[PDB]
Symmetry: D2
Subunit: 249 residues, 4 copies
């Protein structure tokens, strides 16, 4: 199943889409400058591009840590991003009440990994009718993903992306099971599967090897965070994706 | 470090405390009935007991499964449980705004595993001044519990219980690392550590083996998401009494 | 199923048997000293005891590392240990040809964990008719032990002990699944199950005590352990727990 | 570091080498037939090829299951393969005494994973001077491969291949850590790394093989286990990705 995001076709047998941008929104001008760069690079490489950021640092590690710009100022920055660039955007939500007004602005809304089993947030996300990105928790198997998709379907929204970020492997370590992408396609009705290579690594030659290996299994998209390093990175990812997508299934 | 919960002393060198009750509150009548059974068994054996229930069923497996009575009517039920049995109670909270009103009635407030890194919730829980049960995520290592404890301490609350639930072990399976109890005591100032045996089991023989193994390491309490109860508790009490009666090694 | 090893009765509902000694035999005199210590402590505590050592260093870390005294001198030392102390002994074998000569002298022969699926070694060990200790590989699940047991039975030997040594847990780490003991008992005919606490690991001997107590709480036939009187202090506590567990009806 | 195996160059920056054949040697005519098919297909696509089989199946799922033709007859069969097709061959050794007899006939000798820490066997394999494939145990981390490599070096043999076969992942189940390849390259001096996709496990073998080879590897290790007739379709896709990845500079 493909999904249309404005102009963009996202699917497991389509050219890969890049989801990319900043950990946490800090200021308008800082964001425009990051986004500008991703757009120029993707535009000449001809890679469809969706801008990502959080407006809220929900898991900030110290009670004195930066909070983010908050919802109100974050949606303003997102509104500026879409008007200046004409691209879709994606952000995460952590509370049912945030869902409707986030979804008014942001093309894709994201269910945070920690919160995948929070049923009221699932329902409030489903209700908006928007494309939803479901971040697979490190503690859930690719087979348990259908249970979450079932909830979204029962609540009447089938426009779902599944997003891989690694699996718990002993203490304090992650491994990405390259067979899990296939399992998710097979049990979840060939919904778009994308690969969050950045969070898979947190526990760069390493990021390139991992991104290539995951994209070799034929995926809808790549999901990251951030002289000319991105561009050279994406040239290599595009070369692989083009080849893979050109072979019959 | 011991924690006083009304007339109960909770600590890794005190007689173990049983936490248990019902999954989700629906009615007063139904709650009082379950709680009465726990009370009668634990009283007969002399085991301290804290009644546990959710007012919001936040991770129900179907979206349309009953969501619980909700905050307002839930707290009314908890009030009547406390009045009728004279025991402490515990419930989980989900948003910052819930913490104060819940803490007015519930002696222990519980931080759900999936919220354990939500800084706003941790702060609002800390500010109640109540005893807090921290449920350990199955993907978090025992040494990472320190970081959560730290956040609570920064926000002014040291009355913390750590609740073991098992660890991710390949796909689907959980294993309980019996060494992780000691790592938590050692790294987290010997806060009371309790063992949620049920979650780890996703059969009576299995629950018994696992509960006995954990209690053998010397723990403040046993946490169920559960004369069947009585027979099980007779065995746990036997082990706990033996272990606790002996001094920690020289 | 219980096993007689000379005068010792090994079984999951019998008093636990301690297995211990040294890693690699170095000389007759230091062997006899180490054994005397274990014998002194276990006799005074009333615990049956089987001495263990390797005559071999098959996995020695450097090609220049110490080899051990080897089979011929190894077997001589085991003869002397047995004549001096009148206790059974246990050693590992890594090659099929080693099995019959080693079994001449050693009461129990041990299938190293790395080799537990090596069909020729299984067969050669089985043919000796001796008591065999099967080390569960860290990479095998408890439900797979039935397959190795089945092979030993096809090769004609049912005097089998199963030995837990932990399971792979990410890179460079082991966890012991306390539910595995019960799975082995249930699927392998209640053969004696023993717990290699020493290999399951890797303040600190705090750790070995915690692990040993947690494992013995599940009701096991025996324990593998290595040594002012730490061994004594550990065993007093393990024996108290074992006596309680074994006095409860299953 | 590259290794020459007769006229084949094996290396992490060279066209991938296929190590393929069967599990256990069973009979002469069947072996030759299966080898013929591998040879035909790899020759057709220009893929360097090394025939693999065991003469001693040491971990059979039942004790009286056929162990294989044994050393003497197994080496005769390998001789016939090399004579008929003119390709290199690879087999596993199980005891020190086997190492010399096997190495005089076989181009690559393999250290089974379950024996990987047996020092006596490592020493005797090292002393042949033969190219050695080291099979990484599923319970061993990538950074611990350097300890095995060091024992081989100490005994005088540096012609070593590292073979990935997956890592234990909970019970009864394997995951391949795609970052494990780079760790082995970095810590073991960029010795050739190959990927045993068969023992790491359909559509799956292909996904897994393509992911592995995307990280830039010296070879692919499989048993036909694949259906033998779909071999060409499988290899066309591997070769396409390998040719892409190898054609770009590193970094
Ligand atoms: Cl996660
Ligand atoms: Cl092992
Ligand atoms: Cl292995
Ligand atoms: Na208060």
């Amino acid at each position: 199943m493909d999904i249309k995001i404005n102009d963009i076709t996202l699917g497991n047998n389509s050219p890969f889409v890049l989801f990319g941008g900043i950990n946490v929104l800090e200021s308008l001008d800082s964001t425009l400058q990051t986004c500008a760069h991703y757009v120029e690079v993707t535009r000449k490489l001809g890679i469809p591009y969706i801008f990502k950021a959080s407006f809220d640092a929900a898991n900030r590690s110290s009670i004195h840590s930066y909070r983010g710009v908050g919802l109100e100022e974050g949606l303003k920055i997102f509104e500026k991003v879409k008007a200046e660039f004409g691209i879709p955007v994606i952000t995460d939500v952590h509370e049912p009440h945030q869902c409707q007004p986030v979804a008014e602005v942001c093309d894709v809304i994201q269910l945070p990994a920690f919160l995948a089993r929070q049923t009221d947030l699932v329902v409030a996300m489903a209700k908006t009718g928007n494309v939803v990105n479901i971040k697979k928790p490190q503690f859930l198997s690719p087979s348990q993903m259908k249970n979450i998709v079932e909830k979204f379907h029962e609540a009447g929204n089938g426009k779902l992306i599944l997003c891989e970020r690694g699996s718990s492997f002993g203490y304090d370590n992650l491994v990405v099971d390259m067979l899990g992408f296939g399992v998710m396609k097979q049990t979840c009705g060939n919904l778009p599967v994308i690969f969050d290579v950045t969070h898979s690594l947190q526990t760069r030659a390493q990021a390139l090897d991992l991104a290539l290996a995951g994209m070799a299994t034929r995926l809808a998209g790549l999901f990251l965070e951030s002289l000319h390093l991105l561009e050279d990175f994406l040239i290599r990812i595009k070369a692989l994706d083009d080849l893979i997508k050109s072979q019959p299934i």
